[PDB]
Amino acid sequence: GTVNWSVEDIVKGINSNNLESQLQATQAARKLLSREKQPPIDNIIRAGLIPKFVSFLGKTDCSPIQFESAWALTNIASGTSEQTKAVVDGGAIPAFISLLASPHAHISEQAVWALGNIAGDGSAFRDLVIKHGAIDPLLALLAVPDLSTLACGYLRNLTWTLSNLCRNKNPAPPLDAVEQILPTLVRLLHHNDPEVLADSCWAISYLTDGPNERIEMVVKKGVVPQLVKLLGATELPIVTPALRAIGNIVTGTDEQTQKVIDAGALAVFPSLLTNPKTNIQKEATWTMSNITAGRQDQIQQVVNHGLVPFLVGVLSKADFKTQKEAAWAITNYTSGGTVEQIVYLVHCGIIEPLMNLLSAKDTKIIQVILDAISNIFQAAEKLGETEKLSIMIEECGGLDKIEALQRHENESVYKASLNLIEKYFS
């Protein structure tokens, strides 16, 4: 019937003066654009069909052609930026926003999806969707006493589209749009559907990826406990955005960071720092490095939760990028920590794996490790045990590594190594 039409036949049907012929041709276009292999998006664009599809969005008396054209345009807009731009350039944004209020749920849903693809292109189209007024009608679809009364797929698409309105930087979404969206988003973050939770978490991760004022807007809504609960979820697609969001929040102020600690986040990090997914381990170690850059009482809570042995483990064995985050966590710890916290780090076995990382062909980590070594030596100096540390570094083969760093191709690396071997190993 409408399966596997040629673009030429689609054009012929859409150019008829016959709404039903246009309907079958639009469905045939939709099916072409919905096939799994290589949808002919560019051929459909070059055929000049986008303006007609956009006009079909307005045919209230033929809801089927509204649906079919919304779907066709959704999938054109799923393509490259040039292809999305063709849909926008055809006037699709206001037509899709008007379909959000359609009495037909499948049509409103298709318009939700289309606007998500447009917004997902990047900041400009995101902001253009916002300027055309998409937020009010989108949130009105979710203004129900219980989200569970909405169709699962409808709710997931609404959540994914809202997430794209939260996504991307340079610029971040308009502050007023974020504030308008957040109460609904927090409600989605408590919904029981794993895909809704994942995309809600992603939205929160995007909103917290920025200056402390953006972080504060989110934290003020009280989402941190729910993020920490989701941080302990079994579904990796939920842990990943929940961890990203928690990680973003701890890049903010000590108060914002303390909110994460008080919600119980640190109790989940034994699992996160040993998580078999490398990206989780990395992001968790990155989050830890930003926590160990906090207050001494925050470092202390890291100690109290038993996480220093987990940092020693990551430093001892992990993907190199995770190990680099762990090196940063140690340098931050030793720069801000008390002497008692720093010695505790040594008793946990940090020296050997830290020295072993000096044999890496990466200059940044080398400088980070040398800074940590210096901080630990300064702590030992304050205790008079400087020599004992020197021995330990020598026994593990570290002295040789620092001596070799003298002959490195970086000034700070050479100068740092020379200063250590002169101040402590002479």
Binding site: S34, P39, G79, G116, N117, G120, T251, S289
Partner: peptide
């Protein structure tokens, strides 16, 4: 010292199958 930062294989945009 804080350091800041449905067809499948899809996150930014979604093609409806």
């Amino acid at each position: 010292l804080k350091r800041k930062r449905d067809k499948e294989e899809v996150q930014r945009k979604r093609r409806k199958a």
